Design brief:
part of a larger assembly, 4 chains, A little secondary structure (about 50), B mainly beta (about 50), D mainly beta (about 100), A: about 50 residues, little secondary structure, 1 helix, about 10% helix, B: about 50 residues, mainly beta, two-stranded antiparallel ribbon, about 30% strand, RNA-binding
RNA sequence: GAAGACAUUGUCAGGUGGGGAGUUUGGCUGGGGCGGCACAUCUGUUAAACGAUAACGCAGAUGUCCUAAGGGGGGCUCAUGGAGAACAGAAAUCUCCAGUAGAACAAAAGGGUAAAAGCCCCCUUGAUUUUGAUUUUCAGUGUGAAUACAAACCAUGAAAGUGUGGCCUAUCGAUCCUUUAGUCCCUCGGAAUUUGAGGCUAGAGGUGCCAGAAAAGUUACCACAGGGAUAACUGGCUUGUGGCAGUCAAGCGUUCAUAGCGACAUUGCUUUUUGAUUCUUCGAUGUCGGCUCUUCCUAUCAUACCGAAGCAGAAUUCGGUAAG
RNA sequence: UGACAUUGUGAAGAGACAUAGAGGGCUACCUUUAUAGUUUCU
RNA sequence: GUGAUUUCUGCCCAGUGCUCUGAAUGUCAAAGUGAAGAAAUUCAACCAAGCGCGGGUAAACGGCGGGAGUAACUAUGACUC
RNA sequence: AACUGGCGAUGCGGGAUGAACCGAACGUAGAGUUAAGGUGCCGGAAUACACGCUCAUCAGACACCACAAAAGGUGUUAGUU
RNA sequence: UCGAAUUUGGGUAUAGGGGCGAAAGACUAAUCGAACCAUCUAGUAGCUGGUUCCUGCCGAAGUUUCCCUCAGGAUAGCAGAAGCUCGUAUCAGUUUUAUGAGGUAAAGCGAAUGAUUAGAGGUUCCGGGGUCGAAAUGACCUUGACCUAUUCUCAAACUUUA
RNA sequence: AGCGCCGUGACGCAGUGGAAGCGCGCAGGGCUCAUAACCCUGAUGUCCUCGGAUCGAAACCGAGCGGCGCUACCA
RNA sequence: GGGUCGUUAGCUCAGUUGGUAGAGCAGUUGACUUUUAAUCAAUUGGUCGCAGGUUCGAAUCCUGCACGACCCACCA
RNA sequence: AUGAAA
């Protein structure tokens, strides 16, 4: 027949996620020394909508 | 073309198939035999013939 | 609602799937349109039971 | 059809050349050897891509086989074949045909 | 940090796999499809008194069956009817007379047969080997079936004789492959032995579309080469069917077959229906109805003039010249 | 999915293969038991 | 897959699919093991998944019957087979 | 479908007209004689000879061929008893 | 239909069994049930069309058998050409004499088989019975069988004859 | 128009050449004051009709009679 | 508009394919009962819609004739 | 389990 929608969404020309209005990844800070031997202080400076 | 629905006789299992009306389909050579019955041993039925 | 070229449900003078939509996990890429690796179907009546 | 177990028939056996007694037996089609040239060629022919390569027959009609015999001379042990007509039911153990009997 | 000789990756083998690929999807045919087999065959008839002879012509049949239902020999004669014989009657078993076949011979049908080819009894496996010749279908090719001999070995019979399957007409299968029997023969090609493999002669395993491919559909999205060899419009021959008009008159009509009707029967006409055929047209005749508009036929609905009436008048029915 | 290779270093069980003894319908099993080696699942 | 809201989604897991068992003399490839043979090779056992066996599943594909008799008019048939 | 002869492949003379019917099969010409068909005019050939039938207010006119039937008529002619 | 699932420029991505599709098999440069270009390729065709000067001589077939064979081939036949061996006969789409074979036309059914019309005359140990009567293989009457000779019509799968 | 199926007691439905099955219905006895139910018993099927083959069929093959089913497309 | 089927007691239904109308419901009388109902017995009704052949002879054989019950009916 | 009308 012909390729079908999921079978083209894998290849992903027009189905790639949109990225212009995102703040990057949301992640936990790296487990370097402090989070596995003690703690560290941080300041929530702001809160923001992610698109 | 003919749809056929038939009962497996030694098992009791339905079997539906279909194939054109003019193509060849195999048939076995079924036979009934009317056997008399005597004293039943372990699970094997016990039937005799006239000769 | 598609054509039979465009999907494994498509075509027919009536909008009907025709061949059952419950698809094996060991199917292939091209056949896995529909309900995939399903254990039961229909309306559940009761509890998720977990 | 029915046949006895022994038969008086010609034996071209280089000492009989006359009517001797012959033990009859059926002909069984015989187990197939590998390494016969057809099977060797066929395994080579099917080796690899191309799918099926020789025909294979399904449009079948005959519901009977010809029955065929082996004739073992009592003196020479010289086997011999002779063929008979087509029969659905065949038998060598012969309960004779008694004419004067009931149903 | 995790995980650890597992995973992974490589190569083979088993499965699943229209997701994808390749290919096929018989023939005959009063168009094709459904149906059927007239596709391999057999009997009788069509078939026109040698032979041959068609159609989806008629009535049927075959893909099987028999160690006897084959071969020989001997003894009897069948179906049916009449007259009897307890139970026993229409039909149980026995006897006599007639009994040219009216029975039986594996089956379909047709031939054939009466000290037999039928029924019973006795003995057997000629339903065996070597291969050639001949007939039928016929290309005088093959397959199948059958005929008559030769060389052997046998059966049966007192013997002449008869016997190579079934009383005759049908009952079946090439190459390649597999397998078996015979010769225990040939070869395996640097020389040997032994396994194994390949050869010669003769059979089976099967192609029923039966001189023998290995094979499902759809397309109204459709494509191509063609076809009036082939359908659906119109026309043409035909008119069953549709319609119209006659001949006869059992009866209806108060009395009376005919004023008007006219059963049972039958002869015609028309092509306005609907079939049948396939002559023309498939390198296209634009295909139903309505609207418009002309013209023609009469088997006249009305109007003109008439005839008949179960026509008093009125109204009506039948009929003639008549398509103005 | 399985086998081999990749792929080296360790053990703790269990199942079966042959020998002998008890419970069983001249005697075949099945239930068990004790052996020197052999394979295989965890 | 179905197509706002309201109301409501009945019965059928036999078939085809999907999925979960393994407690099994079924089937069971290659590699590997044993026996025979002088070897090619043959034969036997074992045996992964799958298939077979058995559960679940219909807002999965889909499916959802006939015949009789009977009521104080007759007809009809609550009822019964 | 059978037998034969033709048409296809075949002109000429006739059937007005026509693949097949009838006559006859073909070199180029001349002279005669015929076939089948015809002789009022078209049209070459007798409006010939002879014996009768028919008047039709839808005559009839020459094979295949181009239609016409059952049933009737004090029309008319010739007959039978 | 018109403030939006709105309309639009430019850049940019997705490429042919692939893309893209608010889904029509629509769009993919006037091309879409698989674009366009070039080659393989002078692809294949049992199918259609066409197939080039003159004259002379001879001159057909649409039939047999087999073929996934029915618009085509192979084969045999029909027909040309090359001739070869001999020279009036080892011939004839013919008649006559003699001898065979056929079972169609026609004919027949008081001849077999099958079908068929109607009577009479009998046999009733004889089918149904109606009567005389207790009944009686006793008696009578009627009505279907059977028997006798008769009559009418028939047969592609009936036949003496022919 | 063409093809196929089916006809079993009163009713429904099985039925295989050696010879009819089940359930309901029906009848009789017993319990019951009576019927139902219940317990003990028994019976009824030219197997549509005709013919044929067969030693013999309900079955197997023609005829008819009846009740149904399937085809009916491309124009 | 034709092709088929049938019009049976007051109601309904077999009929017998040819010689005689049968069954049920209904009604009338009787039995039963204190009288009824139901139940049991007996009779009642029948040219079976108009003419033909006519089996000796006809409702049913079938020919037409008035009532009904089904099946068909441009065409591209 | 049921038990007609006055």
């Amino acid at each position: 027949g012909r390729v079908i929608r999921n079978q083209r969404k894998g290849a992903g020309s027009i189905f790639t996620s949109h990225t212009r209005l995102r703040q990057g990844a949301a992640k936990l800070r790296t487990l370097d020394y402090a989070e596995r031997h003690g703690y560290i202080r941080g300041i929530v400076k702001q809160i923001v909508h992610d698109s | 073309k003919v749809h056929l629905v038939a009962i497996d006789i030694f098992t009791g299992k339905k079997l539906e198939d279909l194939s054109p009306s003019t193509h060849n389909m195999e048939v076995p050579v079924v036979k009934r035999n009317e056997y008399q019955l005597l004293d039943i041993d372990d699970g094997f039925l016990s039937l005799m013939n006239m000769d | 609602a598609m054509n039979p070229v465009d999907h494994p449900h498509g075509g027919g003078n009536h909008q009907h799937i025709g061949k059952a939509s419950t698809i094996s996990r060991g199917a292939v890429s091209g056949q896995k349109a529909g309900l995939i690796a399903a254990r039961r179907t229909g309306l559940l009546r009761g509890s998720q039971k977990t | 059809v029915n046949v006895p177990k022994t038969r008086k028939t010609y034996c071209k056996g280089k000492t009989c050349r006359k009517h001797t007694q012959h033990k009859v037996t059926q002909y069984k089609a015989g187990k197939a050897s590998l390494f016969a040239q057809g099977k060797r060629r066929y395994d080579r022919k099917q080796s690899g891509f191309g799918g099926q390569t020789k025909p294979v027959f399904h449009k079948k009609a005959k519901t009977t086989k010809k029955v065929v015999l082996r004739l073992e001379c009592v003196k020479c042990k010289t086997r011999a074949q002779l063929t008979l007509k087509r029969c659905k039911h065949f038998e060598l153990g012969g309960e004779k045909k008694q004419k004067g009997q009931a149903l």
